[PDB]
């Protein structure tokens, strides 16, 4: 049963080609001519080197060219690299230079912003013309299921982010059981949200176009305003909603503060990223109800996007009226998710212990972080030909069978919706000269330094020079 999740992609536009694909406010695809312009473009990729395992970097901005540049590299056979075209230069550098990118797809207003590039460049809104006399046909056998899909960076303690590698079986996986999950059918609307740096995008993008769905790309200027945000989405007549819970959390409080009715196409909201206040919840079935159905979805990076998924809205009352809301139940039987205690032994039910994943959810490691990895990427010492990766999070399973998060057991935390670990602001903060010892702590951000040689503007100084190393959620709001 050996699938890549282009294949997959491959074997809807044969069902439903003339089916719209992509929607942005600025045109349109359906699933054949996706499907060609990619195949274009993964043809131009194979003769600039573009194999299995070789890694391409993309600079785009949210478009359908975004989406046209993702499956053309996966059918190429590379792994793609997000490459945030809002991080600075050296971030963007460090990363290209950390994953050896000899590929970039990107557009010619992204052209400088890598700290320059020896690599082929292919700007995908300049050379259009050029792409167009390469092949429309499918390529075959580029890929094998283990072989990498994308290599997406998260924040890294030590000072560095580092890539999380993710293999096409993993990601096939996990879109089969949530294209099953959430009913995803070709009526479906689904918006994209999420900035393709965080693989929650992935969930949008595939689920969508591996079951016919209509992927319709946001706007910057949408999210600013919820009233904006729930009018363009019944504009667009959205039936889905994937959304990190603190945008989640803004969009109950409008929704009771004003008197706004949902998108009448809405029927699923998935939410995730973050710990979901019991308040809020309570504060949207009182005043939505259980229509549109409300998903927590939870999981790590290393565990392919989601793990775990509750659904809120068929909870009951009293299940709903705890100090925490479940994340619930393995999204598949082929994913594991242990509660496990400090030698790595299941617990009886209600005894917390630290969450674990296993099975076919797992990243295949870091990238070029062998201590990293062994230590994350755990082997499994009941079941040695299998790996167990170590969360970081705390969790419990309920009697009724649901699990539990519980926090932490460590400095990772969530700004805007965004993995930071404390430690990778602290470890930067420390480089500069007149700085001498640092805590950055939540709740959001607010720095706590003693100063080596001080001005008064030392706070506008370590804006600018956190400002031109790491991205902007990672800077902090105050400090002190
Ligand atoms: N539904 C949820 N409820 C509570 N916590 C969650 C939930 N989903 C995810 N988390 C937490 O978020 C972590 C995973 O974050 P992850 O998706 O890896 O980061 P990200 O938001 O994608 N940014 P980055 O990893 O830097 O690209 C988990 O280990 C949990 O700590
Ligand atoms: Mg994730």
């Not at 206040?277 to 109800?289: A, C, H, I, S, Y």
């Not at 950055?440 to 370590?462: F, G, K, Q």
Request: glycine fraction near 6%; hydrophobic fraction near 40%; aromatic fraction near 8%.
């Amino acid at each position: 049963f050996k699938q890549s999740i282009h294949q997959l992609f491959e074997t809807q536009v044969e069902r439903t080609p003339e089916a719209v694909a992509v929607l942005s406010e600025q045109g349109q695809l359906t699933y054949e001519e996706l499907n060609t312009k990619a195949n274009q473009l993964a043809h131009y990729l194979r003769t600039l080197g573009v194999k299995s395992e070789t890694l391409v970097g993309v600079c785009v901005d949210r478009s359908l060219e975004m989406v046209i540049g993702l499956l053309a590299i996966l059918k190429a056979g590379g792994a793609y690299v997000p490459l945030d075209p809002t991080y600075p230069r050296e971030r963007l550098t460090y990363m290209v230079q950390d994953a050896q990118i000899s590929v970039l797809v990107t557009q010619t207003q992204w052209s400088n912003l890598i700290s320059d590039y020896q690599g082929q460049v292919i700007c995908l809104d300049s050379q259009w013309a050029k792409i167009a006399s390469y092949s429309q046909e499918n390529l075959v056998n580029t890929v094998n299921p283990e072989n990498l899909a994308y290599v997406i960076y998260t924040s890294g303690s030590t000072g560095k982010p580092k890539g999380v590698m993710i293999e096409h079986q993993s990601l096939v996986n996990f879109t089969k059981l949530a294209i099953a999950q959430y009913q995803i059918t070709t009526s479906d609307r689904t918006l994209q949200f999420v900035s393709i740096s965080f693989d929650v995008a992935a969930e949008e993008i595939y689920v969508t176009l591996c079951s016919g769905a209509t992927l319709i790309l946001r706007t910057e200027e949408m999210i600013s305003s919820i009233p904006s945000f729930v009018q363009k989405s019944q504009d667009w007549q959205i039936t889905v909603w994937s959304l990190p819970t603190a945008y989640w959390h803004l969009l109950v409080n409008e929704l009771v503060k004003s008197k706004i009715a949902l998108p009448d196409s809405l029927r699923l909201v998935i939410i995730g990223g973050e710990r979901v206040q019991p308040e809020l919840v309570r504060m949207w079935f009182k005043n939505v109800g259980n229509f549109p159905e409300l998903i927590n979805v939870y999981g790590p990076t290393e565990g392919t996007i989601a793990v775990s998924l509750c659904r809120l809205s068929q909870l009951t009352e009293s299940q709903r009226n705890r100090t925490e809301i479940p994340i619930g139940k393995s999204l598949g039987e082929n994913i594991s998710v242990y509660v496990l205690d400090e030698t790595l032994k299941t617990v009886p039910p209600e005894t917390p212990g630290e969450i674990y994943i296993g099975g076919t959810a797992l990243a295949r490691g870091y990238l070029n972080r062998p201590e990293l990895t062994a230590q994350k990427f755990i082997q499994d010492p009941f079941s040695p030909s299998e790996r167990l990766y170590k969360t970081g999070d705390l969790g419990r399973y309920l009697a009724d069978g649901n699990l539990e998060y519980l926090g932490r057991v460590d400095h990772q935390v969530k700004i805007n919706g965004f993995r930071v670990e404390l430690g990778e602001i602290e470890t930067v903060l420390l480089q500069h000269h007149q700085v001498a010892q640092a805590v950055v702590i939540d709740r959001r951000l607010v720095a706590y330094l003693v100063p080596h040689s001080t001005e008064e503007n030392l706070t506008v100084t370590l804006q600018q020079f956190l400002k031109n190393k790491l991205p902007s959620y990672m800077i902090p709001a105050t400090f002190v």
